Amino acid sequence: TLVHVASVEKGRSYEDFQKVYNAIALKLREDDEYDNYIGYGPVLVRLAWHISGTWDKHDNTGGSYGGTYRFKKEFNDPSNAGLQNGFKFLEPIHKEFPWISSGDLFSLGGVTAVQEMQGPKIPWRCGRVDTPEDTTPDNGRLPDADKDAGYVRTFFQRLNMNDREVVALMGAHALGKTHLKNSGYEGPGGAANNVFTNEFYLNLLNEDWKLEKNDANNEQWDSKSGYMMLPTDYSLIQDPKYLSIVKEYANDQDKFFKDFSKAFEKLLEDGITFPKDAPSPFIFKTLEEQGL
């Protein structure tokens, strides 16, 4: 098992990272047209998850630490199709703040997006260090969407996530949309959202879902309201243990926010050893809280 020790960017502190947060947040506000006015929030959340979701608890390969998404093998992963948009968004931020590591930037992009979209505060720790090209994990570590609850449960054990953590994390599927050219799934169109809420769970429970084939000849669940769910999303109401948790989050916005915050921080920190004298996690103020 590889050890990756968090190492604070030299001389940097909370205020430095709040500046980076602010630059990302201001650009999120500025570049509002992206993806039919969804904006870049959802894709940045997905990017933070995909750079983290390569982790394997068994040998500490993959994970957010090394910033390896910057290397061609990983950015060309078919599982990552469309994330180049998030990377391009972050390029000018990195140019302005060249001192931040790639892993810190990609993960901070996700935290910033969640908070700016009115989601929970996500505490965030610095200190990821760029590692060489040969540390890039092979393609195929990110999950398939065409599978069932048993697949989801087993998949997430590799990331050390339990049922509650899985169901909480999946609530991010309130955000943005599927794009046929990226993943072979499509929708929503007009029903897409860039505000972080517990809508995913409400939709699972309340919509009249029909199993249909999309234009890529893949099955997905669609509703008359114009919403969609992936087979893996729908599996959360097919499995009785997942279903109980779906009901809980559908009925308690605050609980969902608290549990998502913990699971998302954990996801972004998997694989990293924080020295006992490392700084405490940072909680960034939103632009709104700063009057900016």
Ligand code: HEM
């Ligand atoms: C079983 C696990 C998961 C599967 C199979 C899955 C699959 C997918 C697929 C196929 C898309 C559409 C990509 C596209 O066409 O652009 C998507 C989008 C997205 N995913 Fe997941 N995902 C999973 C878990 C997660 C998790 C844990 C998060 C974060 C906590 C997340 C965040 C997102 C976001 C925010 C989008 C929207 C991106 C956009 O609008 O551009 N997903 N996911």
Ligand SMILES: C=Cc1cccc[n+]1C
């Ligand atoms: C907004 C819907 C959505 C987006 C991405 C993945 C799954 N879903 C259900």
